[PDB]
Short mmCIF file of C-alpha atoms in Angstrom, two decimals:
data_model
loop_
_atom_site.label_atom_id
_atom_site.label_comp_id
_atom_site.label_asym_id
_atom_site.label_seq_id
_atom_site.Cartn_x
_atom_site.Cartn_y
_atom_site.Cartn_z
CA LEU A 1670 -2.06 43.68 -7.47
CA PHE A 1671 0.98 41.93 -9.01
CA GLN A 1672 3.95 42.06 -6.88
CA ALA A 1673 7.14 39.92 -7.64
CA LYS A 1674 9.84 38.08 -5.35
CA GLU A 1675 13.32 38.54 -4.84
CA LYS A 1676 15.35 36.54 -1.83
CA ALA A 1677 14.31 32.99 -1.57
CA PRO A 1678 11.97 32.22 2.28
CA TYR A 1679 15.91 30.83 3.25
CA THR A 1680 18.78 31.85 2.98
CA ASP A 1681 22.16 30.10 0.87
CA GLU A 1682 22.95 27.32 3.92
CA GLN A 1683 19.96 26.89 5.06
CA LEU A 1684 18.78 26.16 1.21
CA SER A 1685 20.37 22.61 1.08
CA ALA A 1686 19.34 22.22 4.86
CA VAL A 1687 15.75 23.22 4.01
CA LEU A 1688 15.50 21.05 0.61
CA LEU A 1689 16.65 17.74 3.07
CA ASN A 1690 14.54 18.23 6.16
CA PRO A 1691 10.85 17.41 4.42
CA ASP A 1692 9.39 19.33 7.85
CA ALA A 1693 11.33 22.03 7.33
CA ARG A 1694 8.47 25.38 7.39
CA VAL A 1695 8.82 28.80 7.48
CA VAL A 1696 7.24 31.23 9.47
CA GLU A 1697 5.83 34.89 9.05
CA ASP A 1698 8.49 36.82 10.92
CA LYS A 1699 6.93 39.31 13.21
CA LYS A 1700 9.33 42.44 12.22
CA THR A 1701 8.89 42.20 8.54
CA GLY A 1702 5.74 40.13 7.95
CA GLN A 1703 7.61 38.07 5.48
CA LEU A 1704 7.36 34.71 5.18
CA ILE A 1705 10.90 32.57 6.04
CA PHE A 1706 12.61 30.00 6.84
CA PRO A 1707 13.01 30.39 10.74
CA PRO A 1708 16.68 29.83 11.54
CA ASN A 1709 15.94 27.53 14.36
CA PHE A 1710 13.84 25.38 11.06
CA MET A 1711 15.35 22.20 11.69
CA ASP B 1179 7.11 37.29 -24.78
CA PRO B 1180 3.32 38.22 -24.19
CA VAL B 1181 2.54 34.89 -23.60
CA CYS B 1182 3.94 34.84 -20.47
CA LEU B 1183 2.55 38.10 -19.21
CA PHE B 1184 -0.80 37.05 -20.05
CA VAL B 1185 0.21 33.41 -17.86
CA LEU B 1186 1.58 35.50 -15.17
CA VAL B 1187 -1.32 37.64 -14.71
CA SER B 1188 -3.90 34.82 -15.17
CA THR B 1189 -1.98 33.11 -12.44
CA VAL B 1190 -2.04 36.05 -9.79
CA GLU B 1191 -5.56 36.35 -10.70
CA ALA B 1192 -6.14 32.75 -9.70
CA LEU B 1193 -4.38 32.90 -6.39
CA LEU B 1194 -6.17 36.08 -5.51
CA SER B 1195 -9.28 33.81 -6.89
CA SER B 1196 -8.50 31.25 -4.63
CA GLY B 1197 -7.70 33.90 -1.69
CA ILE B 1198 -4.02 34.33 -1.27
CA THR B 1199 -2.01 37.22 -1.02
CA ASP B 1200 1.57 35.36 -1.09
CA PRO B 1201 2.33 31.92 -2.23
CA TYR B 1202 5.12 31.12 0.72
CA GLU B 1203 1.26 30.98 2.79
CA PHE B 1204 2.21 27.39 1.63
CA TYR B 1205 5.17 26.69 3.18
CA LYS B 1206 3.22 26.60 6.72
CA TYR B 1207 1.86 24.05 5.67
CA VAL B 1208 3.89 22.21 2.88
CA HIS B 1209 7.11 21.54 2.12
CA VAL B 1210 8.43 23.71 -0.36
CA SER B 1211 9.02 20.17 -2.56
CA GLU B 1212 5.29 19.71 -2.78
CA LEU B 1213 4.30 22.32 -5.13
CA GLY B 1214 4.27 21.74 -8.74
CA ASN B 1215 3.08 22.94 -11.93
CA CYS B 1216 2.18 21.87 -15.10
CA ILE B 1217 0.75 24.76 -17.33
CA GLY B 1218 1.70 24.14 -21.01
CA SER B 1219 0.41 25.48 -24.47
CA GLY B 1220 0.17 25.00 -27.86
CA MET B 1221 3.47 25.97 -29.12
CA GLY B 1222 5.80 28.43 -27.19
CA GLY B 1223 6.39 32.22 -27.69
CA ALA B 1224 5.46 33.77 -31.03
CA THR B 1225 7.68 36.34 -30.69
CA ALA B 1226 10.97 34.13 -30.53
CA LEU B 1227 9.78 31.63 -32.07
CA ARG B 1228 9.41 34.12 -35.58
CA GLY B 1229 12.06 36.57 -34.80
CA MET B 1230 14.89 33.56 -34.21
CA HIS B 1231 13.81 32.36 -37.79
CA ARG B 1232 12.36 35.53 -39.67
CA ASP B 1233 13.89 38.72 -38.11
CA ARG B 1234 17.38 37.52 -37.38
CA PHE B 1235 17.67 36.48 -41.13
CA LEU B 1236 17.48 39.91 -42.15
CA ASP B 1237 20.01 41.66 -39.51
CA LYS B 1238 17.99 43.44 -36.77
CA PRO B 1239 18.50 44.41 -33.57
CA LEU B 1240 18.30 41.29 -30.26
CA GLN B 1241 18.51 40.59 -26.59
CA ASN B 1242 20.84 37.44 -27.40
CA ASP B 1243 19.25 34.41 -25.50
CA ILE B 1244 16.18 35.06 -27.54
CA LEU B 1245 16.05 30.81 -27.77
CA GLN B 1246 15.30 30.47 -24.53
CA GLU B 1247 11.24 32.22 -24.83
CA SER B 1248 10.33 30.33 -27.95
CA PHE B 1249 10.22 26.60 -25.76
CA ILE B 1250 7.03 25.74 -24.26
CA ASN B 1251 8.10 25.01 -20.58
CA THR B 1252 9.68 28.78 -20.67
CA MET B 1253 7.02 30.57 -19.27
CA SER B 1254 6.29 27.78 -15.95
CA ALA B 1255 9.72 28.98 -15.83
CA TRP B 1256 8.82 32.36 -15.56
CA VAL B 1257 5.83 32.11 -13.06
CA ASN B 1258 7.45 29.75 -10.69
CA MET B 1259 11.19 31.77 -11.05
CA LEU B 1260 9.76 35.34 -9.49
CA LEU B 1261 5.79 34.29 -7.12
CA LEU B 1262 7.16 30.55 -6.15
CA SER B 1263 10.66 29.40 -5.55
CA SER B 1264 9.22 25.81 -5.47
CA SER B 1265 11.30 22.85 -5.83
CA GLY B 1266 8.57 20.63 -6.59
CA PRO B 1267 7.64 18.65 -10.05
CA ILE B 1268 7.27 20.96 -12.97
CA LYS B 1269 5.53 19.00 -16.28
CA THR B 1270 4.80 20.77 -19.57
CA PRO B 1271 2.16 19.27 -21.57
CA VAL B 1272 1.37 19.96 -25.57
CA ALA B 1273 -2.12 19.31 -27.36
CA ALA B 1274 -2.45 22.27 -29.65
CA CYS B 1275 -6.45 23.10 -29.31
CA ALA B 1276 -6.59 20.57 -26.08
CA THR B 1277 -3.47 21.40 -23.67
CA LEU C 1376 12.05 5.46 -9.29
CA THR C 1377 11.48 8.11 -11.69
CA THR C 1378 11.05 12.41 -10.33
CA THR C 1379 11.97 15.94 -11.64
CA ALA C 1380 12.28 18.91 -9.71
CA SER C 1381 12.45 22.66 -10.17
CA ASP C 1382 15.10 24.32 -9.01
CA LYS C 1383 14.63 27.69 -6.63
CA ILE C 1384 14.61 31.51 -7.59
CA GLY C 1385 17.24 31.98 -10.05
CA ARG C 1386 17.08 34.94 -12.55
CA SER C 1387 18.49 33.00 -15.45
CA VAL C 1388 16.58 30.52 -17.44
CA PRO C 1389 20.18 28.63 -18.28
CA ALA C 1390 21.40 28.57 -14.84
CA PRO C 1391 21.49 25.43 -13.19
CA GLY C 1392 20.56 24.95 -9.51
CA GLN C 1393 20.15 21.42 -7.30
CA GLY C 1394 16.19 20.42 -7.30
CA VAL C 1395 16.64 16.57 -7.76
CA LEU C 1396 18.47 17.02 -4.42
CA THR C 1397 14.76 16.68 -2.60
CA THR C 1398 14.87 12.40 -3.67
CA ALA C 1399 16.90 12.24 -0.24
CA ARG C 1400 15.27 14.61 2.30
CA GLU C 1401 13.90 13.10 5.16
CA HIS C 1402 14.48 13.08 9.04
CA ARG C 1403 16.32 10.73 10.05
CA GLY C 1404 14.87 8.93 13.04
CA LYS C 1405 16.88 8.01 15.81
CA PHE C 1406 15.47 4.53 15.44
CA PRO C 1407 14.93 2.95 12.57
CA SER C 1408 10.95 2.64 11.10
CA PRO C 1409 10.66 -0.73 11.71
CA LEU C 1410 9.12 -0.86 8.06
CA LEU C 1411 13.03 -0.67 6.62
CA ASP C 1412 13.12 -4.40 7.94
CA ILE C 1413 11.87 -6.38 5.09
CA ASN C 1414 11.22 -9.03 7.42
CA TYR C 1415 8.99 -6.94 9.46
CA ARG C 1416 6.96 -5.94 6.73
CA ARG C 1417 6.99 -9.88 5.98
CA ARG C 1418 5.20 -10.09 9.01
CA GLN C 1419 2.59 -8.01 8.52
CA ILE C 1420 1.95 -8.81 4.93
CA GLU C 1421 1.63 -12.62 6.15
CA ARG C 1422 -0.63 -11.23 9.40
CA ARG C 1423 -3.03 -9.27 7.33
CA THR C 1424 -3.09 -12.26 4.89
CA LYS C 1425 -4.99 -14.16 7.50
CA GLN C 1426 -7.74 -11.66 8.09
CA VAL C 1427 -8.34 -11.38 4.21
CA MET C 1428 -8.89 -15.30 4.78
CA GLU C 1429 -11.31 -15.47 7.56
CA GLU C 1430 -13.10 -12.12 6.42
CA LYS C 1431 -13.85 -14.27 2.81
CA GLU C 1432 -15.17 -17.13 4.94
CA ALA C 1433 -17.96 -14.42 6.65
CA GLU C 1434 -18.51 -12.52 3.41
CA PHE C 1435 -19.71 -16.42 2.47
CA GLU C 1436 -21.51 -16.92 5.67
CA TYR C 1437 -23.46 -13.58 5.44
CA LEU C 1438 -23.93 -14.82 1.26
CA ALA C 1439 -25.63 -18.35 2.39
CA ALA C 1440 -27.68 -15.96 4.79
CA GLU C 1441 -28.59 -13.82 2.39
CA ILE C 1442 -29.65 -17.09 -0.13
CA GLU C 1443 -31.72 -18.50 2.65
CA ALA C 1444 -33.16 -15.06 2.90
CA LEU C 1445 -33.97 -14.80 -1.31
CA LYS C 1446 -35.31 -18.35 -0.56
CA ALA C 1447 -37.64 -17.09 2.18
CA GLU C 1448 -38.45 -14.54 -0.23
CA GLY C 1449 -40.29 -17.06 -2.74
CA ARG C 1450 -37.84 -15.93 -5.81
CA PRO C 1451 -36.72 -18.23 -8.71
CA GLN C 1452 -34.18 -21.24 -8.40
CA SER C 1453 -32.40 -19.46 -11.20
CA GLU C 1454 -32.28 -15.65 -9.96
CA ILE C 1455 -30.53 -16.99 -6.67
CA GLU C 1456 -28.40 -19.65 -8.61
CA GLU C 1457 -27.34 -16.49 -10.79
CA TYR C 1458 -26.79 -13.82 -7.79
CA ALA C 1459 -25.09 -16.46 -5.60
CA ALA C 1460 -22.76 -17.45 -8.53
CA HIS C 1461 -22.16 -13.61 -9.38
CA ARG C 1462 -21.80 -12.73 -5.57
CA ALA C 1463 -18.83 -15.41 -4.79
CA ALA C 1464 -17.21 -14.41 -8.21
CA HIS C 1465 -17.59 -10.79 -6.73
CA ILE C 1466 -16.32 -11.92 -3.35
CA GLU C 1467 -13.43 -13.79 -5.00
CA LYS C 1468 -12.59 -10.68 -7.07
CA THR C 1469 -12.76 -8.17 -3.26
CA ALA C 1470 -10.39 -10.90 -2.04
CA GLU C 1471 -8.08 -10.48 -4.72
CA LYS C 1472 -7.98 -7.23 -4.63
CA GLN C 1473 -7.54 -6.87 -0.79
CA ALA C 1474 -4.40 -9.36 -1.02
CA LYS C 1475 -3.25 -6.73 -4.05
CA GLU C 1476 -3.71 -3.67 -1.96
CA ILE C 1477 -2.04 -4.85 0.82
CA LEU C 1478 1.45 -5.47 -1.26
CA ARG C 1479 0.66 -2.40 -2.80
CA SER C 1480 1.00 -0.81 0.94
CA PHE C 1481 4.42 -2.35 2.12
CA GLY C 1482 5.59 -4.20 -1.14
CA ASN C 1483 6.03 -1.35 -3.28
CA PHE C 1484 4.50 2.04 -1.71
CA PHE C 1485 5.09 2.12 1.98
CA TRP C 1486 7.19 4.87 1.96
CA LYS C 1487 5.31 7.10 -0.28
CA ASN C 1488 3.82 9.83 1.59
CA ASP C 1489 6.55 9.71 4.83
CA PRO C 1490 8.99 11.97 5.85
CA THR C 1491 11.00 9.97 7.39
CA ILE C 1492 12.07 8.24 4.31
CA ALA C 1493 13.63 9.29 1.29
CA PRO C 1494 12.59 8.12 -1.84
CA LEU C 1495 15.44 7.16 -3.54
CA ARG C 1496 16.18 5.56 -0.48
CA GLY C 1497 12.03 3.81 -0.46
CA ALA C 1498 12.74 2.98 -3.91
CA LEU C 1499 15.96 0.77 -3.49
CA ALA C 1500 14.35 -0.68 -0.41
CA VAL C 1501 12.01 -1.95 -2.35
CA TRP C 1502 14.29 -4.77 -3.56
CA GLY C 1503 15.91 -4.93 -0.29
CA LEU C 1504 18.51 -2.91 -1.96
CA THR C 1505 19.95 -0.13 0.64
CA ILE C 1506 21.90 3.64 -0.95
CA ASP C 1507 24.91 1.54 -1.04
CA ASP C 1508 23.82 -0.38 -3.86
CA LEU C 1509 23.69 2.00 -6.16
CA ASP C 1510 26.93 1.32 -8.12
CA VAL C 1511 26.66 3.04 -11.71
CA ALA C 1512 25.73 6.93 -12.03
CA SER C 1513 25.17 8.20 -15.81
CA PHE C 1514 25.60 11.55 -15.83
CA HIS C 1515 23.99 14.55 -17.68
CA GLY C 1516 27.44 15.57 -18.32
CA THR C 1517 27.51 18.66 -20.84
CA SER C 1518 31.14 19.19 -20.54
CA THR C 1519 30.86 23.09 -19.35
CA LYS C 1520 32.41 23.92 -16.39
CA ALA C 1521 29.32 24.67 -14.03
CA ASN C 1522 27.22 22.06 -14.68
CA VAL D 1725 -18.17 -22.32 -15.56
CA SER D 1726 -18.51 -24.94 -12.97
CA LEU D 1727 -16.43 -23.51 -10.15
CA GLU D 1728 -16.74 -24.71 -6.73
CA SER D 1729 -18.16 -21.83 -5.43
CA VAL D 1730 -21.58 -22.87 -8.21
CA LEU D 1731 -21.39 -26.05 -6.42
CA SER D 1732 -20.81 -25.37 -3.04
CA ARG D 1733 -23.81 -23.08 -3.37
CA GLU D 1734 -25.89 -25.92 -3.78
CA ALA D 1735 -24.06 -27.41 -0.91
CA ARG D 1736 -24.35 -24.40 1.50
CA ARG D 1737 -28.00 -24.44 0.39
CA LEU D 1738 -28.57 -27.24 2.26
CA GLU D 1739 -27.81 -25.61 5.64
CA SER D 1740 -30.42 -23.74 7.63
CA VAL D 1741 -30.86 -25.85 10.96
CA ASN D 1742 -30.63 -28.95 13.97
CA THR D 1743 -26.75 -28.20 12.33
CA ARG D 1744 -23.77 -26.25 13.42
CA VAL D 1745 -21.39 -25.12 9.86
CA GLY D 1746 -18.05 -24.32 9.11
CA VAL D 1747 -16.40 -22.66 6.45
CA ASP D 1748 -13.27 -22.63 5.26
CA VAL D 1749 -10.87 -22.09 2.29
CA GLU D 1750 -7.35 -21.86 1.74
CA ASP D 1751 -4.46 -22.03 -0.73
CA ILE D 1752 -2.69 -24.32 -2.06
CA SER D 1753 0.63 -22.86 -1.90
CA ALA D 1754 0.27 -21.80 2.01
CA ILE D 1755 0.01 -25.56 2.40
CA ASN D 1756 4.08 -26.48 2.91
CA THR D 1757 3.59 -29.72 1.56
CA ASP D 1758 7.26 -30.00 1.79
CA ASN D 1759 7.65 -30.13 5.27
CA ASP D 1760 7.23 -33.55 7.13
CA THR D 1761 7.34 -32.44 10.28
CA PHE D 1762 3.64 -30.70 9.62
CA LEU D 1763 2.25 -33.60 7.28
CA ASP D 1764 2.64 -36.12 9.97
CA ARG D 1765 1.39 -33.29 13.11
CA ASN D 1766 -1.59 -32.72 10.89
CA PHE D 1767 -2.35 -35.58 8.95
CA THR D 1768 -3.14 -39.29 9.16
CA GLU D 1769 -1.00 -41.84 7.45
CA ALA D 1770 -4.44 -42.82 5.26
CA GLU D 1771 -5.00 -39.29 4.69
CA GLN D 1772 -1.02 -38.96 3.78
CA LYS D 1773 -0.97 -42.60 1.45
CA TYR D 1774 -4.20 -40.70 0.20
CA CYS D 1775 -2.77 -37.28 -0.95
CA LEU D 1776 0.41 -38.86 -2.23
CA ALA D 1777 -1.18 -41.25 -4.71
CA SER D 1778 -1.85 -40.80 -7.94
CA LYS D 1779 -5.96 -42.12 -7.45
CA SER D 1780 -6.78 -38.71 -6.55
CA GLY D 1781 -6.74 -37.61 -9.59
CA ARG D 1782 -4.59 -34.63 -8.12
CA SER D 1783 -1.07 -32.96 -7.67
CA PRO D 1784 -0.53 -33.82 -3.82
CA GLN D 1785 -0.16 -30.40 -3.12
CA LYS D 1786 -4.04 -30.02 -4.10
CA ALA D 1787 -5.23 -33.24 -2.43
CA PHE D 1788 -3.05 -32.23 0.89
CA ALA D 1789 -4.90 -28.90 0.84
CA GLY D 1790 -8.62 -30.30 0.87
CA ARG D 1791 -8.02 -32.03 3.25
CA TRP D 1792 -6.21 -29.29 5.69
CA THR D 1793 -9.33 -27.04 4.62
CA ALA D 1794 -11.75 -29.54 5.27
CA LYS D 1795 -9.98 -30.24 9.06
CA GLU D 1796 -10.77 -26.38 9.65
CA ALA D 1797 -14.38 -26.29 8.36
CA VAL D 1798 -15.02 -29.35 10.28
CA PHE D 1799 -13.48 -27.95 13.39
CA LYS D 1800 -15.64 -24.70 13.19
CA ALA D 1801 -18.43 -27.02 12.40
CA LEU D 1802 -17.91 -28.42 16.25
CA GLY D 1803 -17.99 -25.41 17.34
CA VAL D 1804 -16.01 -26.04 20.36
CA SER D 1805 -12.88 -24.14 21.69
CA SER D 1806 -9.60 -24.04 19.93
CA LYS D 1807 -6.80 -24.89 21.95
CA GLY D 1808 -4.54 -22.50 20.27
CA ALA D 1809 -3.49 -22.09 16.45
CA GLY D 1810 -0.96 -24.35 17.28
CA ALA D 1811 -3.41 -27.49 17.80
CA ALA D 1812 -2.75 -30.56 15.48
CA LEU D 1813 -6.04 -31.26 13.95
CA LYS D 1814 -4.91 -34.95 13.33
CA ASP D 1815 -7.93 -36.08 15.41
CA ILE D 1816 -10.45 -35.11 12.22
CA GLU D 1817 -9.98 -37.78 9.47
CA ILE D 1818 -10.56 -37.51 6.21
CA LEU D 1819 -10.80 -40.61 3.79
CA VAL D 1820 -13.03 -41.08 1.33
CA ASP D 1821 -15.91 -43.45 0.35
CA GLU D 1822 -16.87 -46.23 -1.94
CA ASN D 1823 -17.92 -43.71 -4.08
CA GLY D 1824 -15.04 -41.37 -4.19
CA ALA D 1825 -17.17 -38.72 -1.25
CA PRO D 1826 -15.40 -37.16 1.49
CA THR D 1827 -15.81 -39.40 4.94
CA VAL D 1828 -15.41 -37.57 8.55
CA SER D 1829 -14.15 -39.47 11.06
CA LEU D 1830 -13.49 -38.33 14.32
CA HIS D 1831 -10.57 -39.23 17.28
CA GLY D 1832 -9.22 -38.36 20.33
CA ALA D 1833 -9.99 -35.11 21.57
CA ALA D 1834 -12.41 -34.38 19.14
CA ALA D 1835 -13.94 -37.16 19.20
CA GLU D 1836 -14.92 -36.07 22.97
CA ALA D 1837 -15.26 -32.42 22.05
CA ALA D 1838 -18.11 -33.67 19.43
CA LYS D 1839 -19.81 -35.84 21.66
CA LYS D 1840 -19.95 -33.38 24.89
CA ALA D 1841 -21.34 -31.25 22.15
CA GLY D 1842 -24.35 -33.83 21.17
CA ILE D 1843 -23.08 -34.00 17.45
CA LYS D 1844 -25.48 -36.57 15.66
CA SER D 1845 -22.26 -37.11 13.34
CA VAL D 1846 -20.40 -34.74 10.95
CA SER D 1847 -20.39 -34.51 6.83
CA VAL D 1848 -18.47 -32.09 4.47
CA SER D 1849 -18.51 -31.23 0.96
CA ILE D 1850 -15.19 -30.20 -0.64
CA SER D 1851 -13.74 -29.04 -4.06
CA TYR D 1852 -11.06 -26.31 -5.48
CA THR D 1853 -10.52 -23.19 -7.21
CA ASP D 1854 -7.26 -22.97 -9.26
CA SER D 1855 -5.41 -21.05 -6.30
CA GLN D 1856 -7.50 -22.71 -3.09
CA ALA D 1857 -9.07 -25.76 -1.42
CA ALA D 1858 -12.53 -24.73 -0.34
CA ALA D 1859 -14.57 -26.45 2.07
CA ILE D 1860 -18.26 -26.75 4.21
CA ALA D 1861 -18.28 -29.12 6.67
CA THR D 1862 -22.14 -29.72 8.93
CA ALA D 1863 -22.26 -31.35 12.17
CA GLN D 1864 -25.75 -31.63 13.30
CA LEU D 1865 -26.83 -30.73 16.90
CA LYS E 1425 -13.57 -3.06 12.77
CA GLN E 1426 -10.44 -5.49 12.09
CA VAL E 1427 -8.31 -2.38 11.51
CA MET E 1428 -9.37 -1.88 15.39
CA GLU E 1429 -8.54 -5.56 16.66
CA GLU E 1430 -4.90 -5.41 14.88
CA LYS E 1431 -4.10 -2.37 16.21
CA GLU E 1432 -4.74 -3.75 19.70
CA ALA E 1433 -3.29 -7.20 18.65
CA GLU E 1434 -0.10 -5.15 17.76
CA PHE E 1435 0.12 -3.23 21.42
CA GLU E 1436 0.03 -6.45 22.82
CA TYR E 1437 2.76 -7.58 21.00
CA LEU E 1438 4.38 -4.32 21.69
CA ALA E 1439 3.57 -5.22 25.32
CA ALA E 1440 5.86 -8.59 24.91
CA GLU E 1441 8.88 -6.97 22.68
CA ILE E 1442 8.86 -4.76 25.95
CA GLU E 1443 9.12 -7.59 27.99
CA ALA E 1444 11.30 -9.10 26.13
CA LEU E 1445 13.86 -5.80 26.13
CA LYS E 1446 13.91 -5.99 29.84
CA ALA E 1447 14.61 -9.40 30.07
CA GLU E 1448 17.70 -8.42 27.72
CA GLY E 1449 18.89 -5.93 30.51
CA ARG E 1450 18.50 -2.62 27.77
CA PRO E 1451 18.39 0.53 29.42
CA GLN E 1452 14.92 1.86 31.08
CA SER E 1453 15.19 4.93 28.34
CA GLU E 1454 16.17 2.88 25.22
CA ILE E 1455 12.73 0.90 25.78
CA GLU E 1456 10.96 4.49 26.80
CA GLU E 1457 12.13 5.55 23.18
CA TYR E 1458 11.59 2.36 21.36
CA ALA E 1459 8.19 1.63 22.88
CA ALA E 1460 7.11 5.31 22.06
CA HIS E 1461 8.39 5.44 18.73
CA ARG E 1462 6.71 1.78 18.27
CA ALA E 1463 3.37 3.46 19.69
CA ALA E 1464 3.57 5.79 17.17
CA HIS E 1465 4.12 3.97 14.27
CA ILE E 1466 1.61 2.03 15.12
CA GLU E 1467 -0.50 5.19 15.18
CA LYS E 1468 0.59 5.78 11.79
CA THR E 1469 -0.12 2.55 10.85
CA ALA E 1470 -3.73 2.07 11.64
CA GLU E 1471 -4.31 5.81 9.83
CA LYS E 1472 -3.16 4.02 6.85
CA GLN E 1473 -4.98 1.65 6.67
#
């Protein structure tokens, strides 16, 4: 039932930019089914 | 500390009783700043609290950062760390029975 | 301004992250929002005030009408005196509440819940100040190499 | 307490028919008594002399505000079309009688408007909260 | 109701600012942009009210 995370939904370059674009939103990645900040989230 | 395990599972159970399978779901709709945590306790991890005084005074084996598990905020930190990645506000009430 | 932020997924409980950054989040829209001019906001307050005034007068004429209706119902002079004085105090109180909600809306909290104004910015802008007017910073400064 | 609510209540209680009415209320603060151009444009020399005189029993700012409110209330009681918010109210003069009660004198365009509107005469009731002059004016059809 | 009226009034003031910016000789695009932005801003304000 519990299943822990490891990676952030973003990556280390996106990090600050997600922290600064309040309209940043994830998408479901169609290949992995994960929720991630898409590379073009800005 | 065992109370952390109680909190983690109560949290996940609450997510499921909300019909949510992955907290990152929120980040479709809201910014990673907008998610907060205000879970608290009468006191922190009783194991760590006790062991740090009593058992170290008897020179027994220990994991060394044990002090941190004695703090009330740490259970909330663990919930965030492993499940949420939130940037939002985190607060920590203390009221023994009324917390 | 006062605020607290969590850091993100880090697997050390001590490790310092960067969550308080988020105070600076906004979209730098192509124009400034007119709200960033205090004079525009000044107009808007001074504007809405007028409507509050009119609305107060209108209220009192509706009360004038309710008074005449209560008379027509045959009610006690005192009951109407009382109802009217009470209602008048209530009308006054309402106009005050409006004036304050306008001040709260445009003066104190205009940037709360706006994705194009960073909270640190908005908080300074209340006082006509900008990020250039933050002169001093008192640092957590723990003499640790990482922090 | 003896608020102008409690007393204008009685004044307002006189009006139902043969009459058109204006209610107006203005902040003592909103009236710019430090601007001679505003005073000269909207008040007569007699009104200014009264408002500046100690015999009014009031601060000058209160006195001018009551007159301003009264003019606006009178204008509303006339019910005629405004010439826009920039129009001068100097044609509506608000003096006191021998008993200290307010008196409405109409001049110029206000007098012509009242006559076209069939107005018998105009009367007014005025007093103050701590922050605002309040006036009700009444023009009989 | 007042909010509605106030919104209409805002838009006529914007109509007037538009004509003023034209008279200043400004770029068509700058005015398009300023106006669309201002319109969205007016809408947002009425919502806030």
